[PDB]
Amino acid sequence: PRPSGTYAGLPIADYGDAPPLSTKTMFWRTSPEKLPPGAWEPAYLGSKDERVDGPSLQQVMRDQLKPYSEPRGLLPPQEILDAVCDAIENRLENTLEPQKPWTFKKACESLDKNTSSGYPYHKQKSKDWTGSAFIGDLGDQATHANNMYEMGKSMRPIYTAALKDELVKPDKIYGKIKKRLLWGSDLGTMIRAARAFGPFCDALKETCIFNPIRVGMSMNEDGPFIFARHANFRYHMDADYTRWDSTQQRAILKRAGDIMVRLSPEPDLARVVMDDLLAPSLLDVGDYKIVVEEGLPSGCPCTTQLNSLAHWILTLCAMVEVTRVDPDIVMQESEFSFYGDDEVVSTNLELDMVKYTMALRRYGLLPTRADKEEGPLERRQTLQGISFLRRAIVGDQFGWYGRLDRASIDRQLLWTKGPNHQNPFETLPGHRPSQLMALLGEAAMHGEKYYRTVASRVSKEAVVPRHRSVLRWVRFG
Numbered sequence: 504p505r506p507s508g509t510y511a512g513l514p515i516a517d518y519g520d521a522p523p524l525s526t527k528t529m530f531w532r533t534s535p536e537k538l539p540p541g542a543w544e545p546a547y548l549g550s551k552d553e554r555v556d557g558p559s560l561q562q563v564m565r566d567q568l569k570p571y572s573e574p575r576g577l578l579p580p581q582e583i584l585d586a587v588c589d590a591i592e593n594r595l596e597n598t599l600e601p602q603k604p605w606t607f608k609k610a611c612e613s614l615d616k617n618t619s620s621g622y623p624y625h626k627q628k629s630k631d632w633t634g635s636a637f638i639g640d641l642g643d644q645a646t647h648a649n650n651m652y653e654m655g656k657s658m659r660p661i662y663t664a665a666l667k668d669e670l671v672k673p674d675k676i677y678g679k680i681k682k683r684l685l686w687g688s689d690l691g692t693m694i695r696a697a698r699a700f701g702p703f704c705d706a707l708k709e710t711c712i713f714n715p716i717r718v719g720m721s722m723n724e725d726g727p728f729i730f731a732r733h734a735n736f737r738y739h740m741d742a743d744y745t746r747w748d749s750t751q752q753r754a755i756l757k758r759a760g761d762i763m764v765r766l767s768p769e770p771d772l773a774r775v776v777m778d779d780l781l782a783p784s785l786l787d788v789g790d791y792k793i794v795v796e797e798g799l800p801s802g803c804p805c806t807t808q809l810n811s812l813a814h815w816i817l818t819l820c821a822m823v824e825v826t827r828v829d830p831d832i833v834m835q836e837s838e839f840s841f842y843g844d845d846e847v848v849s850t851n852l853e854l855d856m857v858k859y860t861m862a863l864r865r866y867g868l869l870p871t872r873a874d875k876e877e878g879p880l881e882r883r884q885t886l887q888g889i890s891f892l893r894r895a896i897v898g899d900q901f902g903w904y905g906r907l908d909r910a911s912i913d914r915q916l917l918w919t920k921g922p923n924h925q926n927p928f929e930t931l932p933g934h935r936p937s938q939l940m941a942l943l944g945e946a947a948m949h950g951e952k953y954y955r956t957v958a959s960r961v962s963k964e965a966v967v968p969r970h971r972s973v974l975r976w977v978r979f980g
């Protein structure tokens with residue numbers, strides 16, 4: 504750890520080991536025809552992107568790192584924070600079934616084998632996986648990490664920075680180029696965090712309908728119940744935060760982590776891992792590993808739950824600050840849904856929206872109105888039209904459900920995933936059945952008319968069910 508200075512506003516701690524940022528996309532066009540105006544396309548691919556002449560990917564990454572050197576917003580008032588945290592912990596103790604510890608074997612099995620091991624080998628995890636265990640280098644890395652876990656010994660996570668290959672609005676390619684920062688965790692940290700927090704994460708997933716952290720929900724199976732519950736409350740809103748992860752305070756995440764640790768079956772071992780996760784983070788940006796003291800270190804498996812929990816603490820602190828009602832009463836009078844930064848907030852309380860917005864902003868968060876104008880967040884008295892997990896919530900005669908917007912459905916027709924390549928507009932030879940049947944489902948939820956337009960598009964080239972049938976399957980079966 505010898506070099507020094509400042510990289511993208513953040514301290515340099517060492518030289519970096521990360522491989523080069525990706526110059527390819529997994530998205531291919533489904534026909535050679537020209538795309539409509541305003542059509543979304545895969546994010547910028549760097550100096551070799553034929554579509555535009557933009558900055559280096561490393562510069563694009565430096566842009567994403569800016570928010571992490573911004574100053575934090577403020578802690579909620581301490582007396583409110585303490586009471587909110589207690590009420591959250593208490594609700595979780597009243598609902599979660601105690602779990603057994605996770606074994607090394609279980610931890611290994613849980614890892615997604617089709618992503619990278621991160622530092623130091625940067626290889627797809629499948630490559631040292633036998634079907635039942637890690638061998639070779641990953642085996643060594645995993646076993647060592649597991650030993651350290653069992654001994655309650657600290658290890659420093661090393662995260663690897665990347666940029667997300669996804670379809671984006673054209674202006675993010677042909678205007679001011681943007682591309683989203685991803686933190687990839689090192690396999691050692693994944694093994695330790697899996698063993699320590701997999702149990703809590705499982706317990707919490709079993710309650711995803713009765714508790715606000717919805718991670719693990721099935722939209723088609725649980726959405727109807729989840730949204731029917733929200734609708735029992737009068738006022739509905741969604742703060743639609745900007746840059747949620749980069750604006751988090753580690754002090755808040757430490758509060759969320761404390762709760763996770765105390766509700767874990769190996770709390771002394773889990774405490775060591777959570778402290779490592781929340782200590783100033785080492786992020787490999789290629790040239791340098793830099794130190795990031797603030798924001799969400801979003802590599803590991805449990806981080807969505809941790810982030811969700813931090814979301815819960817802040818939303819509730821803001822509501823208590825403004826309404827001056829006790830946390831437990833706010834919770835009696837509300838239904839929340841959280842998935843990382845994504846929220847739905849339903850309440851019977853008459854919130855002073857201007858005062859609510861100001862408190863969120865005082866905490867360093869960046870809530871945004873639907874019109875992106877300045878001023879206070881808005882609320883409505885129907886759940887319908889609020890979104891969660893990229894679906895509009897819709898109510899009808901049969902009940903509530905989540906519907907994918909037409910535009911997202913169109914997009915999945917224009918593009919298909921396949922191996923990585925350099926030119927997005929290239930069509931993939933050689934035809935995705937189950938994915939077609941799913942698309943018909945979503946199309947169906949928009950009526951027979953739109954369903955039929957999508958149904959023709961699907962027939963090419965390529966068992967096309969009737970609207971009424973498929974609707975019934977997706978809504979009820």
Ligand SMILES: Cc1ccc(C(=O)Nc2ccc(S(=O)(=O)O)c3cccc(S(=O)(=O)O)c23)cc1NC(=O)c1cccc([N+](=O)[O-])c1
Nearest residue numbers: 670719720721722723892893914915918919920921935938
């Ligand atoms: C965030 C997100 C973004 C894109 C997709 C998604 O469906 N992507 C795609 C999958 C498969 C294909 S395929 O090539 O035809 O097989 C896609 C093809 C084109 C475009 C997409 S995409 O929507 O633009 O990514 C595809 C899914 C998600 N994930 C969710 O909607 C999601 C996340 C967590 C939980 C739930 N959920 O419980 O409903 C749903």
Ligand SMILES: [Mg+2]
Nearest residue numbers: 741846890891
């Ligand atoms: Mg939302």
